[PDB]
Symmetry: C3
Subunit: 92 residues, 3 copies
Amino acid sequence: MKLVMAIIKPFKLDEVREALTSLGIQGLTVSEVKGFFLPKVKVEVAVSDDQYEQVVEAIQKAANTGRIGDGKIFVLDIAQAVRIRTGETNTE
Amino acid sequence: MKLVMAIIKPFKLDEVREALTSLGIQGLTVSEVKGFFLPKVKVEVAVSDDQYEQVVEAIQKAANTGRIGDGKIFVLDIAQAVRIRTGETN
Amino acid sequence: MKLVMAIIKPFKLDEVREALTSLGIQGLTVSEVKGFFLPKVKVEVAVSDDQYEQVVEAIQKAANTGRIGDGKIFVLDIAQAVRIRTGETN
Ligand SMILES: Nc1ncnc2c1ncn2[C@@H]1O[C@H](COP(=O)(O)OP(=O)(O)OP(=O)(O)O)[C@@H](O)[C@H]1O
Ligand SMILES: Nc1ncnc2c1ncn2[C@@H]1O[C@H](COP(=O)(O)OP(=O)(O)OP(=O)(O)O)[C@@H](O)[C@H]1O
Ligand SMILES: Nc1ncnc2c1ncn2[C@@H]1O[C@H](COP(=O)(O)O)[C@@H](O)[C@H]1O
């Protein structure tokens, strides 16, 4: 499992959300941050190792303008995940 | 150490905090985030290897309702933790 | 690559930014968070493996007061980084 974190230009949030939803990705978490400043949006989603490359590609293509300030996507390893509703624990 | 990250329903924060305090945790970081919008709370706490699973389970039990939208808890490895007050590691 | 995450007293942000800038690190992400509450600032910066320890030390020295509430620095491994502007993987 991977945590995919992207810092994007705020106007690109709708396109990024759209791209992820088409991939069938659920549980997008979004926050407003300051980018060094200019307002940025941080998007975060946890995905299977099987899905992370498609997720990264989808975010990159949706968030891209080619101009300065486009931002970054960081992928981090998740060792364990628990579904709070059921208490069930998953690992890959 | 491990970074325990949970995305919970905002009204569950008090119960989650109470459970963590009972474990002797106390130090934790809370962010206001948006789920998909629905308001959510992101709780982040770095915990020793000896206690991380107990922290996960404490958060799970406290944040649980059995309803849709309860959220998830993620565990990530921390390679190095520094206490800013003293500069000590891990 | 490493993700350096620091939770600091808000008034220390400028000093931390100055230290990072002197190291040639201008790109960083700042969030307003709640620390258990008191307002805190989360600084996130992805840095190369060869520089992360120098970065951690620089942040610690700039953010330190020696008093309670100074905060924490966590270092996490980054599995992959992509530059959105070009689509290139680090
Ligand atoms: N190394 C980094 N660590 C953390 N956040 C970063 C980092 N680099 C960039 N960011 C975030 O991304 C936002 C946009 O910066 P970006 O990645 O586009 O860098 P840049 O200096 O504009 O270079 P370029 O756009 O040409 O790649 C920043 O304001 C910051 O919020
Ligand atoms: N284990 C932790 N996990 C996540 N965030 C933490 C943790 N410990 C501290 N923090 C964050 O750092 C902020 C400052 O707390 P700090 O680390 O200074 O702890 P403290 O109890 O004041 O101890 P001391 O300052 O003596 O080290 C907290 O309010 C919280 O946002
Ligand atoms: N895979 C995921 N990655 C990151 N955050 C998630 C994920 N799934 C759910 N969330 C967050 O948790 C909230 C409730 O999710 P859930 O209870 O799992 O439907 C959502 O609104 C998201 O903000």
